[PDB]
Symmetry: C5
Subunit: 110 residues, 5 copies
């Protein structure tokens, strides 16, 4: 269970998540828990999406929209992703810090 | 586990959820997690309901009422629906983005 | 699993929940999920209680206090009641919409 | 599963929880769910603690700090206490209503 | 299951968690539940992180950012740490009270 953190900002409107192939030995995903505003964040709506492929096209999932004047935080409940993953901001300058865990589910044939 | 997203707006006061019949092979429902305001949303109360049939009549379930000045967001906990489903706005212009998963429960005779 | 909704207002300061005796065949309770402000709700504190009998007297349990200016909503987590049940407003004009399910636990002798 | 409610106020800065010895037959604790402001509550920070003995000294656990202007409510998740218990206000006038259940875990030797 | 509480303040920008070696007999971690503002807390952003070693370097995990004017509280869900642990404030004067349990998982070879 590795510990992971990243940031989505105006230089990082698109971020790519890819765990190292070694952890792919025990079948691996990414579990996400918290998202918080950065120190350079502006007072606007910051729309973070989780992005993968659906129907062969780039599918985006609006997860949160952080704003200092409404709610600059998010607690990510039950969100588990298959690497590679994309994190996007369709609007906003950031930074928005993403915190999660590189989780590797153990062999379970029960 | 397909990934689903839609929007309820003033052109989409009523939205119809129907998964493709193929996923009906392994018995299927829709699990919902998050709802967020759209970029064209206005500052008013936006009442989203989940709608099915009860007693033979159209039964609505007020789920959320999003408003930028009070709470423009909702985290949908433990909400699982049987397709076809209806999503309604009894008031509001939208858009309000709905995010969930096409979940298909596996055969479990335990 | 029947779907249930009611409203506590100034004409409905006390509401009585009683499921039909047929669902009493498979042992039955009421599970509650969400509560939202009504369209005629005023800007005041609306104190909803779940009421049953304790020590032989009318026992009330303050569950929520909805107000448009503080928090007009509630997400009811882990609340399961034995019918008949009473829902009360010790203050407020309403309406406050209550959403839940008539749940009937199946025979489980494990 | 008895139903319990109390209030911490300026006359009740310290409250003592003690279930009757009869329920001690089946091994008993107290599970807490919700806390709400009283009707006589003032606009200040009301710091409620759960208090027991640690290292032989009076140990307090700040659980919540209710205030009408910030957040007058709390939903107590996963809080289970061994009677006798103390509930304290290190600041505030109250009342603050505490709601929970006298829970008695059944014999389970599995 | 020992009960633990600490505070991160301007004299305690860095706090070290280390359980006594005796509890290391039954394999031990720290489970965290609540965080609340101190009585001497100021109106600023107080960024608490959980810190351990990753890639051989000091890795920090922004957990919360408490502020009286936005949200002075946090409910820590599903957070379990391996002692020794570090708790940091990258900004803020504190105090910020951390509440948790010294939990020791029992032998389970199932």
């Amino acid at each position: 269970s590795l510990i992971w953190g990243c940031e989505l900002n105006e230089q990082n409107k698109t971020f790519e998540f890819k765990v190292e192939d070694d952890e792919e030995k025990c079948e691996h995903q990414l579990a996400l828990r918290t998202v918080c505003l950065g120190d350079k964040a502006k007072d606007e709506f910051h729309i973070v999406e989780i992005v993968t492929q659906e129907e062969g096209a780039e599918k985006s999932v609006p997860i949160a929209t952080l704003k200092p004047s409404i709610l600059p935080m998010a607690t990510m409940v039950g969100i588990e992703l298959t690497p590679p993953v994309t994190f996007r901001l369709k609007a906003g300058s950031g930074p928005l810090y993403i915190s999660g865990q590189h989780v590797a589910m153990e062999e379970d044939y029960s």
